[PDB]
Ligand binder design. Sequence first.
Ligand SMILES: Nc1ncnc2c1ncn2[C@@H]1O[C@H](COP(=O)(O)OP(=O)(O)OP(=O)(O)O)[C@@H](O)[C@H]1O
Ligand SMILES: Nc1ncnc2c1ncn2[C@@H]1O[C@H](COP(=O)(O)OP(=O)(O)OP(=O)(O)O)[C@@H](O)[C@H]1O
Lengths: 544, 544
Amino acid sequence: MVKFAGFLKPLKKTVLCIFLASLLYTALGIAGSFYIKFLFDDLIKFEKLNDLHIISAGFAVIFLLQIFLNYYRSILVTKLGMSIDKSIMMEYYSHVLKLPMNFFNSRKVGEIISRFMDASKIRQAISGATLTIMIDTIMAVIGGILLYIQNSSLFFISFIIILLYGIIVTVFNKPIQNANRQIMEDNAKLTSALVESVKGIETIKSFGAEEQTEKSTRDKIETVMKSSFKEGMLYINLSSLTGIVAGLGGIVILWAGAYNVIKGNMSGGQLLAFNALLAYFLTPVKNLIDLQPLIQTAVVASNRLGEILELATEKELREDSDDFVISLKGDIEFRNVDFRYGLRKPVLKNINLTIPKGKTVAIVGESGSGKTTLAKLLMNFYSPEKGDILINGHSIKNISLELIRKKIAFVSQDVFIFSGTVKENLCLGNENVDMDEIIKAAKMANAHDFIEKLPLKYDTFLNESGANLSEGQKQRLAIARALLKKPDILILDVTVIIIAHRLSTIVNCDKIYLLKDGEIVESGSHTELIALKGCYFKMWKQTE
Amino acid sequence: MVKFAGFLKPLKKTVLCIFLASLLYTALGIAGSFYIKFLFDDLIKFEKLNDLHIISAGFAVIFLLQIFLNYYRSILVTKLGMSIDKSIMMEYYSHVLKLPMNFFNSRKVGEIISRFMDASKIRQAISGATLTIMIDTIMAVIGGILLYIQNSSLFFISFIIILLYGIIVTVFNKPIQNANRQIMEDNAKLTSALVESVKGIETIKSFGAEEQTEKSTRDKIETVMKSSFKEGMLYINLSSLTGIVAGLGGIVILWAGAYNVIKGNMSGGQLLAFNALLAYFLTPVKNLIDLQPLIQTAVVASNRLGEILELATEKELREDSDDFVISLKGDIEFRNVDFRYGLRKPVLKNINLTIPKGKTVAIVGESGSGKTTLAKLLMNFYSPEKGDILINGHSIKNISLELIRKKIAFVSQDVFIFSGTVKENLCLGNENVDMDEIIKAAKMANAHDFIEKLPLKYDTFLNESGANLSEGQKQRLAIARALLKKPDILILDVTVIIIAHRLSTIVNCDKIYLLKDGEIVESGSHTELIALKGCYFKMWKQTE
Ligand SMILES: Nc1ncnc2c1ncn2[C@@H]1O[C@H](COP(=O)(O)OP(=O)(O)OP(=O)(O)O)[C@@H](O)[C@H]1O
Ligand SMILES: Nc1ncnc2c1ncn2[C@@H]1O[C@H](COP(=O)(O)OP(=O)(O)OP(=O)(O)O)[C@@H](O)[C@H]1O
């Protein structure tokens, strides 16, 4: 669609104030643009002093009023630009935070962060000068319709100059757009490269691969600068084609004005005043054209920021919801669930689980069987394509995600810790939870002993992805967080689905499922599985 | 301090060509600034046609030559700016990749990316189109001495205008700098928060947090735009003062010139041509003052990059390398080694670890004893304290870090994968290694099977953080990579140091070290360590 900023609807009064101030400003400018005519035709050509001082003082007062009214519209336009830029950035950030998981696994962090950071633009194209120049271009249309009365042929020449400007801008419409798009794409790729290199640097500084990374970054920077030089060449071509027209048109204006003066009609002071009126007719237009890089860059930034990440399907746009579900204690009843990650290969075949309520079910299989795939399916990070997962007799499709992702706690290997207070880390999601509950969950997660050892026991900072604490001391914070988010289906009288790789820790479990070709081949407790001479028996005898 | 003469000393012919072209350009501009003097006082006041056409054509030719010179000077200036930017940017990037690990563990990924973007700002701001205007200030000095030659009465007023410009810039240099610094700091903080949120959006979705993070990002954006508004107010005050001075000075010039014409030195040329010449004395200065915010922004960004650049690398510290060490087949001899991450608390104290050659020793302890700290100290990621690490009988402090990183392989549980080809992921540091060693290291690491089952075998593409592979499948890639980097002191007849949190895998280790309270309390083989009624005994009986 079209990303037209409708945020100005609550800003109706400000726009009217700006427009009226600009109208009076241009009116005073044109009124004060007769000073040189007053000088040459009447003040000195008649040899009359003691009134030139009065005229000069009056025009100084007029210019002071012009500055006073240009100190106001600039402030108002800056406020409008702030109020638009903040709103558009917040829209984009909320939408990206509510996007599905396929988007986040099929894209690089650099692309998203660069698409956001391309918001200094748009703002720079709606700043004070950039938009007051467009308003003054309209005011220059008004000044030109005034200019038509003040001599005719010179207004025709000015119109021809405007036509030349229009042709020049039209011919250079696409190239600046494409150059900006390509430089933005290359800058996004470079930003992703730096984000990856600085994020994981233990591997680089561990394998002695600084030189290779530097060479790859040099290639990316070389591409960025080549695509920047292309834009520079197009910009210099545009600036030259505009400067030629402007200067030669001004010289033609002076030549034709002299030609008129030495041929009866019109006067020299009329020509001198016509130069300043022609300034208020052309200089806004030429200033706008010289701003075409800024407007074009902002248009490209708003197009990329809105093409995707403002049109892509959201998370909540999945299905309907329900009101009868208030608790999530039930029997999970996978029916022929098939999940394919993208398009590579079906991770899960026609799987079938019969997890009872409040059990301690364990899941085993090959290293690439898809256990974490099952855990992600149960958390609605993804969706099946032919089957129907259920809980308590009703499908989890028809349950509000704010309930599924609140009553199911899932702890994984990729423990992620946020920058902030340990209490703030623990109380993510439900911030209002009191000290007693976080203490209880920490004690139940064995993390309370560690936390009380640190100085500023719970009120201590954790830097970025946990560095103030060891990796084994962050799995326990993940456990404590999952315990705070009081669950009904716990994935590692609440149902516990433990996914583990060692066959010795999960033995005394109510039921154990084993999946090899996606589907479950064997099930039951440990004793019956051992008394089967099956795949689980082979695994147990090999790992004994 | 941050001088670009290092990247500018090679570029001298370009600078000479730019300066000479600019000199001819301003000379032709001053020559063309006599058109109106020729027009009124000689071509109009004498009523002579034809010669008017000839002079108009001549001045059109002069202006065309001016444009032809400005084209080349702009091309050369943009080439110079591009080269300077690339050079400084790569200096910063190489320095940051060579920085120690304390810096990377005490900073955020957002800050580095923001400073790199500020280097890009240095590119766009100052050295892209504005060096053609800084020269014009000196060329305006030339035009001003010519103005004094032309008429000494109005040169005093022009000098007073220049003095007012200077006072305004002097009194507005500081607040613009401070506002730019504050907006850059706040934008860096916003970038850090955003990269943390988008990078680690697993916990935000799982628990449900795309309201708290949204509120925090809204607060950060509000602070960013508050600083932006402060900068905007300072810029508007600057622009208003400059506009008042310029406009009122121009009107005073016109008034005083009319007074001179009626009361002394006269004719229209000495005013109409004087203003055209003044366009080559005051207009470049006003353009420079208008560009001053951009120059100050570039200066602040260069200051931040220089603040990063002065930080010592890893090679600058830990000097006195050695050349007589070729292999790392020796006895690790931790002697009274102490360590302390920053200033929190010593995680190690007087450790007397004495690993022999070629064994398969294991290190065990509590959940925060410091096993991975020992691995980092031996791999030489962090700086030890009183005492030193010995390998092959000599200290580790005097060994080429390249040899250490290429001869000690560390396999940590925070496995990191790079967004590239699988073969490129495997060969990190030594790209020339043939596929035979790749296959051998994969088969020895059991990672060959799943790689072979990938859709595009050993040269498949991987997303960031190995999102295209399972958590178990990613660690086997780390094992295969560390095996490719043929080690001698491999940490998980080469010495093997196994860090494990269990007690059943290490029953076959040659020796077992028990890191409990900073030091090593007990050591030996499994059987003798069980026959010690010590801390390992209670650990074994509790885990049984
Ligand atoms: N994010 C992903 N995108 C695409 N394919 C994926 C992704 N994650 C896993 N796969 C694929 O799914 C299969 C197994 O995935 P999964 O992580 O569920 O396995 P797993 O057996 O549960 O893992 P592990 O036991 O090692 O934790 C493999 O074929 C793997 O390549
Ligand atoms: N980069 C760091 N900065 C500050 N403190 C740290 C850092 N890394 C670890 N610590 C802390 O210092 C101690 C050292 O932890 P370390 O990572 O060495 O433990 P570990 O033996 O690997 O434990 P685990 O059983 O959790 O794997 C811990 O108390 C930890 O919280």
